[PDB]
Design a protein around this ligand. Sequence first.
Ligand code: HEM
Ligand SMILES: O=C(O)c1ccc(-c2ccccc2)cc1
Ligand SMILES: [Cl-]
Length: 393
Amino acid sequence: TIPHLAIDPFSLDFFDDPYPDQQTLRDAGPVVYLDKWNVYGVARYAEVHAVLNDPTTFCSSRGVGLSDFKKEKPWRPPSLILEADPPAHTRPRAVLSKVLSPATMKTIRDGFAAAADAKVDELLQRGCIDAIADLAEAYPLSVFPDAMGLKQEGREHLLPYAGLVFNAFGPPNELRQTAIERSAPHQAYVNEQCQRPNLAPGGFGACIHAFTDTGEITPDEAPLLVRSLLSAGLDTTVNGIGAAVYCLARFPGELQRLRSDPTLARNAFEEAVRFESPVQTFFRTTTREVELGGAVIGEGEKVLMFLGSANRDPRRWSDPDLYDITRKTSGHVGFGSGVHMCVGQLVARLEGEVMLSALARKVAAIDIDGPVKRRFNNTLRGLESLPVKLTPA
Ligand code: HEM
Ligand SMILES: O=C(O)c1ccc(-c2ccccc2)cc1
Ligand SMILES: [Cl-]
């Protein structure tokens, strides 16, 4: 009753161009079985949204990667937030929500915006730049480690660590195994910076430790919650901003609309998240036999969600394959949905907004002027190199 497909959603061929295979997965049925990895798959918006919004049946505490923590040992101690279900999830979630809250955004917005403006001015002086290394990477590296309260030394470990985290949600293919083989120095750096003495006053890390006396988290929980921000808080935004610039380079008509109304910057970034979902896939595990879309899935089964596919499903979106900065993006799943929906989304949106605002006000054209190279990761989607010429406004 459930179609079986041989598509490998963690192959380089899939990463190179996932859209035809995603349509194949959507059109095969609401629920598919992926023989390559012995997991169920859901690629339509309706089922992805339903799975995300039933955490009791589709749990996260057995891992949101291929590995089932009930069968195999996690490669690192489980996350107290991502890899937790309610009720254990609830108070750590509440702490990170307050740390990454509107009030915090107000304290950091001016500095984040100045840094975006300054970066665009710098890039305009160079003219020809790599929008990944020089912009998508450089801008978040210029604001987020400092907002965390990290020392300067060792920040070169942050992107490798995140690439490891997101590769480790995949199956035991070469991307994952190579990442784990090389991981020891990055893990050692990250774990050490999670300790309260290594996090500067006023930053996100220190704020997490300052929440350890309310009864929400204990002091021994705070280093792992800092670890969560050092895992998810940088590489995601690198790929999101890279996606937005890639979209504006490929859709010059939308760059021109954005120039004419820079207050579209925040929605232009949100549409980039929908269109080029930086996080493409991850898993849940069933806690019982469950009927989904008309198929019966047994207990203890991994269910792979295709977030990028759900965000391009024509059952939900009009012209899903168009980048439209005035689209009503409400409901996209690029930040997830439900109780685990990205707790850092206000930081992500702030970065993306202020960067796209700076481009809207300062740049007249973005022209690809060199070979574009993709960066392969088991769950993140984005580019390795994006050579562009920036023309000043
Ligand atoms: C464009 C940038 C980003 C994207 C696309 C993104 C995407 C996501 C998604 C899809 C989830 C849901 C995971 C799940 O349901 O299992 C999530 C959760 C999470 N994200 Fe984000 N994220 C971004 C930026 C950030 C930032 C900047 C931070 C921190 C500063 C962050 C921290 C987290 C954390 C801690 C969780 C787990 C929340 C929970 O389990 O309750 N993310 N993110
Ligand atoms: O370490 C964490 O808590 C953490 C790691 C990865 C993520 C993540 C974000 C988006 C998609 C999948 C996973 C969230 C939290
Ligand atoms: Cl670690």
